[PDB]
Amino acid sequence: GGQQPVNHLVKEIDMLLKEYLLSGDISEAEHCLKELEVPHFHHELVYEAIVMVLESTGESAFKMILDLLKSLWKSSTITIDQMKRGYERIYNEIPDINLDVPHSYSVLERFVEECFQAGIISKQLRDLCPS
């Protein structure tokens, strides 16, 4: 006697991407990430956003995607620990996505290069990047 349990993962992480994709608004995503009580779980979007640029063709992604994380980091929304694990998972997915001959090395390097320059992650993470 009651209602169905609350859903999780589905209709949750996807929302973040969709909102930024069609609409393209910082605050819209801001309030949504702030909606979640788990800050440690903030690493999921971090990873996903990184995957998008690698699977999406167009400068539109790279321009708005990096801006998304940087915007979150503006008010201390994403934690270094979370961002760390987000990138670490990427370095692992690289060989699986590229599957021999990683031509996306240009994107990979520049992306991490910009992130480091932005001052959001130290050299330790950059060292994990195939430089």
């Binding site: 009651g2 209602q3 589905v10 209709k11 996807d14 909102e19 994709l21 309030h31």
Partner: protein, 163 residues
């Protein structure tokens, strides 16, 4: 059409909708609707149910679409729902002032209606730039934004039983 005695209708529907969100009785609403007997003012009901749900928690919103689907075919024609959305969109500019998240929710209501089949799909196309209101436009944007999401996971939303 123009609704006669707008406030008198709102005040009367206040408790009706309130009591609905408690245990979710879609039959209660219809039963009472036939009692009132409305024509063009009939679109008011689905609108108010939506407006109140904006103030309440998100859980109460997802339950609103249930009422719509139940009402349509029983006491509301598919064509009537369309008019209700227009009426709602016009009201949007007002509620958007108090609740900044209001328009974002509105988009979900539209997306769900089309997804289930209680609202025309080309409704968004009909409003494809033919809108001078940015508040109403954002609601139309999110409609596709969200429609693109559960379009694949439509049969995986309800599979948890613990109530």
């Amino acid at each position: 059409g123009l609704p006669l005695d707008e406030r008198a209708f709102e005040k009367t529907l206040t408790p009706i909708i309130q009591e609905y969100f408690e245990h979710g009785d879609t039959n209660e609403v219809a039963e009472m609707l036939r009692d009132l007997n409305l024509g063009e003012m009939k679109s008011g009901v689905p609108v108010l149910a939506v407006s109140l749900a904006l103030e309440g928690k998100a859980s109460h919103r997802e339950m609103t679409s249930k009422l719509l689907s139940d009402l349509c075919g029983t006491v509301m024609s598919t064509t009537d729902v369309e008019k209700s959305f227009d009426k709602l969109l016009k009201d949007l500019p007002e509620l958007a002032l108090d609740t900044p998240r209001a328009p974002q929710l509105v988009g979900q209501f539209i997306a769900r209606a089309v997804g289930d089949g209680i609202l025309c799909n080309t409704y968004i196309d009909s409003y494809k730039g033919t809108v001078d209101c940015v508040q109403a436009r954002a609601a139309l944007d999110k409609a596709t934004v969200l429609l693109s999401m559960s379009k694949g996971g439509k049969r995986k939303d309800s599979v948890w039983g613990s109530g």
